[PDB]
Symmetry: C2
Subunit: 341 residues, 2 copies
């Protein structure tokens, strides 16, 4: 048995996770909010929704951590899925399981870990919701409950998510292995090819419920500047938060993708044109509501957006170019604004 | 109560979620409990503004299933994009007249964040309510906000699920009023009847077995007789909450009598079914149910069986009901499988 031991029913466990079309999918607003809420609740530095996938720990949501994944053998969560009860570690530098672990030895010098297992509907433990911090800590029992509740909310959402048409499309038409081509792991959105694989099914769902398809074409204002002026690390932080604020402006049924370097395209299902502009406005207000922290330095960032509704029978590529022309208008007219066409 | 120009559309966006007059959901129940525990408040509601009433999809610390819309805080709250924060409803010009302020439960503190449909229409509210004046931190206000974001996300995702999509097609908002037991917030027998067929179709289409768990709270009569009706009611509400917490979002749960609950579940084979039946029994046995401060130990008997292929649903029901009675004779607090 490895440095992180496998449950005897590993095969079945990995299968409950595969049937959820979850590993290698984009961040979701709701889970982002949940980890943020957890962090704020307890005051810890890091919070993860970590999924145990073959020999890695892959993060569906995170906060206070830049890594997109970790080998299973380096994980705490990999031990936490081995039991029904929460894995509490008061001080990992003193714990036989983790005092050797490079994440305890080296950065981020994990001391406190509190991990609460997440399950598929069949009871199989697919991963964890966890708090992580560089100072020793022991949750009182009230905190234990809050954390427990927080973990029920995570599971809840994951399980419902597997009862949706997006998830059926994902497992039935997009091999868990193809899914890796389709995802920009920096912003945790679908990429250009990800959008391409999904845009059709999106139109199909709009037609079935008499909805319009609207396209929002956006672009971070003055990205080159911040990226050259401050580190390229600061750039990546700006890309990470912009993507997160974009996901918060959308609804769970929307399709959002990173397209070029600093540009993002949403395809939304709306009743009619004002709903679409509302969404685009919302995207722009969220981006502008606060600065974006870049390692202590707060950086004002705005976005421009062009948007349009796709006509009945219109080639999506055409609707797309129209939104892009509207975005070009938005930039020309002064940036930090939305043009609707 | 002041209502928006776009009341027609707001209402329509709510109606499209197939949401008013539906059963409590475990996840929403966990969420309001999280809220209650986080703020140390007496009452938390997920409140939906529906025509002339205010109906609760989830509630802790409050027994009414709905209240009238007019003079009610939430009909006022949706009207703005911002939280409605009332420090003391009794000294507030808008609300001191309100019967839930001057009569029970003597509301004073109120904090409500609007909840939205996909299109932005405000369909209701997540709110904290307490009989003592209070005013929130910006930190706390921001936590309430993230909780309201979660409730709103859940309700929008729920709207995209197979079952909810089915409810939008088949069972109109009019039919649903009579399919729901108000006290336990579960489907009643009429609900179960309206929905069980659709659950056979899912099981067929996905090569699955159908399982029935037929369960009965133990010594119920004794409880009412010892501690009165209100303590019987406490036991029901809470027992239903645990029924929902031990099953899974896609399972059909219903109240089948004064003290009986029935669950229909899709599963692989027998082992899995008995496992779920035992998860319920455990979960109910795991802690005393609180009644007016006095804690009451509540246990549960249950029978279960799989429905053979093509077996008439009623036959399987009858067999699990027989199995529940074996469990009772064998000493209660247990599951018998057949």
């Amino acid at each position: 048995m490895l440095a992180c031991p496998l449950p005897p029913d590993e095969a079945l466990r990995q299968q409950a996770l595969d049937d959820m079309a979850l590993v290698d999918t984009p961040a979701e607003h709701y889970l982002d909010a949940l980890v943020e809420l957890a962090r704020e609740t307890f005051g810890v530095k890091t919070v993860l929704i970590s999924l145990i996938d073959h020999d890695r720990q892959w993060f569906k949501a995170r906060i206070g951590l830049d890594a997109e994944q970790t080998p299973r053998d380096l994980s705490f969560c990999g031990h936490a899925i081995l039991a029904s009860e929460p894995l509490m570690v008061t001080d990992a530098s003193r714990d036989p399981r983790f005092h050797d672990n490079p994440l305890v030895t080296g950065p981020p010098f994990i001391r406190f870990y509190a991990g609460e297992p997440l399950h598929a509907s069949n009871g199989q433990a697919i991963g964890t919701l966890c708090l992580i911090d560089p100072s020793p800590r022991l949750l009182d029992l009230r905190e234990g409950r809050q954390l427990n509740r927080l973990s029920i909310l995570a599971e809840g959402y994951l399980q419902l998510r597997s009862l949706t048409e997006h998830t059926r499309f994902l497992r039935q038409e997009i091999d868990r292995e193809q899914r890796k081509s389709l995802l920009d792991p920096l912003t945790q959105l679908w990429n250009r090819a990800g959008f391409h694989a999904l845009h059709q099914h999106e139109l199909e769902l709009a037609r079935a419920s008499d909805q319009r398809i609207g396209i929002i074409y956006s672009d971070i204002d003055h990205f080159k500047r911040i990226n050259d002026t401050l580190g390229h690390r600061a750039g990546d932080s700006v890309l990470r938060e912009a993507a997160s604020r974009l996901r918060a402006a959308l609804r769970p049924e929307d399709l959002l993708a990173r397209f070029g370097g600093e540009e993002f395209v949403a395809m939304v299902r709306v009743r009619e044109t004002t709903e679409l502009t509302m969404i685009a406005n919302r995207i722009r207000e969220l981006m502008e509501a606060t600065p974006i922290d870049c390692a202590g330095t707060s950086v004002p960032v705005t976005i421009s957006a062009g948007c349009t509704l796709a006509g009945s029978g219109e080639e999506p590529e055409r609707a797309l170019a129209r939104a892009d022309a509207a975005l070009y208008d938005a930039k020309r007219a002064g940036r930090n604004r939305v043009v609707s066409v």
